[PDB]
């Protein structure tokens, strides 16, 4: 099936006088493989998975050099934005940045990304054509006119369609023993009473890879979002994930309901119910 | 691997 590579950058200011902090992390699908942190001792890009550790010293020195340059760019950007928005130097402010590529079953280019946020909200994004920009307001219009005149979009599109996709195919081959695996969920059901007319059923999915899943409730016909409480997919911490879906039903009809599980590790989609 | 060129907003 399909695969992806992503980098995430966070840059935060402090009152004074106080120096700003910078963090970068990288991911192949749902597996983190590197990090950088300006507050840390090493001042190096560092490994976070065992397959990246087989890159030699030329690889490590080049990622470190490139990330320090990134970090000084976003230091300047914090002061620029407080100027565009007429703010003071007494607060704390946040810039974020994400870029990367998707590939298909064939391992060929599918989609690319490159976008920013200031204080929570969208600032400027590259569109899916990889040719034009979305500016969210008057300040970000200044950023757009500056990047159009210096031809930033053309150089970004080359990276995203070529280089980016080549790093990802290399990482998939080197990390084959773990990156290519797909783990099917181990499933079960729980039941607690609340009162005499209603009780909570809960459908459980455990130990799957990757994170992508769908869990939907039905009764006789199809979908309902009536107290259909579902929680965000969470990491188990050993490289697999977990999820639950739960509905509160009229007590007595606890046999007309069916839970549905869709995962790419499953040979066939799963339907299960509660037995008396 | 990350981008080899950088630019200000």
């Amino acid at each position: 099936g399909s695969h992806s590579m992503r980098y995430f950058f966070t840059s935060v200011s402090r009152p004074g006088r106080g120096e700003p902090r910078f963090i970068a992390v990288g991911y192949v699908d749902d597996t983190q493989f590197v990090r950088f942190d300006s507050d840390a001792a090493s001042q190096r890009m560092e490994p976070r998975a065992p397959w990246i550790e087989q890159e030699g010293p030329e690889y490590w020195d080049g990622e470190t050099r490139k990330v320090k340059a990134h970090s000084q760019t976003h230091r300047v950007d914090l002061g620029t934005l407080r100027g565009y928005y007429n703010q003071s130097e007494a607060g704390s402010h946040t810039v974020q940045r994400m870029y990367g590529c998707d590939v298909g079953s064939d391992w060929r280019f599918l989609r690319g990304y490159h976008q920013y946020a200031y204080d929570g909200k969208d600032y400027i994004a590259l569109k899916e054509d990889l040719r034009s920009w979305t500016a969210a307001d008057m300040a970000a219009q200044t950023t757009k006119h500056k990047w159009e005149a210096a031809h930033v979009a053309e150089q970004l599109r080359a990276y995203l369609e070529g280089t980016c996709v080549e790093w990802l195919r290399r990482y998939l081959e080197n990390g084959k023993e773990t990156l290519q695996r797909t783990d099917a969920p181990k499933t079960h059901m729980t039941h607690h009473a609340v009162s005499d007319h209603e009780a909570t059923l809960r459908c459980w999915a455990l130990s799957f890879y990757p994170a992508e899943i769908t869990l939907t409730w039905q009764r006789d016909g199809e979908d309902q979002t009536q107290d259909t409480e579902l929680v965000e997919t969470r990491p188990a911490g050993d490289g697999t994930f977990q999820k639950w879906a739960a509905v509160v039903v009229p007590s007595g009809q606890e046999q007309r309901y069916t839970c549905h599980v869709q995962h790419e590790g499953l040979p066939k989609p799963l339907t299960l119910r509660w037995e008396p | 691997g990350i981008l080899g060129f950088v630019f200000t907003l």
């Epitope: 000084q72 760019t73 150089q155 | -």
Partner: T-cell receptor, first 109, second 111 residues
């Protein structure tokens, strides 16, 4: 990345028309031309961006190849004010310009 | 504009010397090159953003700094035994885009 320029040297006559070449195996997102006299700062003449684009400045006509892997510089009715070293350059992936080694032109009365 | 001074510089062998480069063009990136007679440009050192620099193709025996956006000084140390050359500085609005060159400096090192 590598840019290769051809010919290294060209010596022609006042009023001749001529073309000089710049080539690569790989694609450039933007490309520039410069003219330099010895002991002096190079002068930027043009930036090109779109595959197939044509631009004209003074007696000069610049062409960007359709695949963005080469460019040419053409002079019409060359004059002794066109004498000098002509350099092509393109956007580098590590945050610089990639340069060719140049074509040195003399125009003779 | 972008300025280098002076036009001509002259020193004894073994003497460290620093060359000037300033611009009020509002550019983020600056570059240094050396050029020998009838030869091409050779990239020494470069700087994509204030407070960061990196090595070009012939960096041995030279150093730089970038404490301010406007200025990018070059020190020729008791370098290699090859210091005599034409030195050119250049600036661009962002790194990898079109460069504007200063007027140049001639340095000659003597016995």
């Amino acid at each position: 990345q590598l840019l290769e320029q051809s010919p290294q040297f060209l010596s022609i006559q006042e009023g001749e028309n001529l073309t000089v070449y710049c080539n690569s195996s790989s694609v450039f997102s933007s490309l520039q031309w410069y003219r330099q006299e010895p002991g002096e700062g190079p002068v930027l003449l043009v930036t090109v961006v779109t595959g197939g684009e044509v631009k004209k400045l003074k007696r000069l006509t610049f062409q960007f190849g359709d695949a963005r892997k080469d460019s040419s510089l053409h002079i019409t009715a060359a004059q002794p004010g066109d004498t000098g070293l002509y350099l092509c350059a393109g956007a580098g992936s590590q945050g610089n310009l990639i340069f060719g080694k140049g074509t040195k032109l003399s125009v003779k009365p | 504009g972008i300025t280098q001074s002076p036009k001509y510089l002259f020193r004894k062998e073994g003497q460290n010397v620093t060359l000037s480069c300033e611009q009020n063009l509002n550019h983020d990136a600056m570059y240094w090159y050396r050029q020998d007679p009838g030869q091409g440009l050779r990239l020494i050192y470069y700087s994509q953003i204030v407070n960061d620099f990196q090595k070009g193709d012939i960096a041995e025996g030279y150093s730089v700094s970038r404490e301010k956006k406007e200025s990018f000084p070059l020190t020729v140390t008791s370098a290699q035994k090859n210091p005599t050359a034409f030195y050119l500085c250049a600036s661009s609005s962002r790194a990898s885009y079109e460069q504007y060159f200063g007027p140049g400096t001639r340095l000659t090192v003597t016995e």
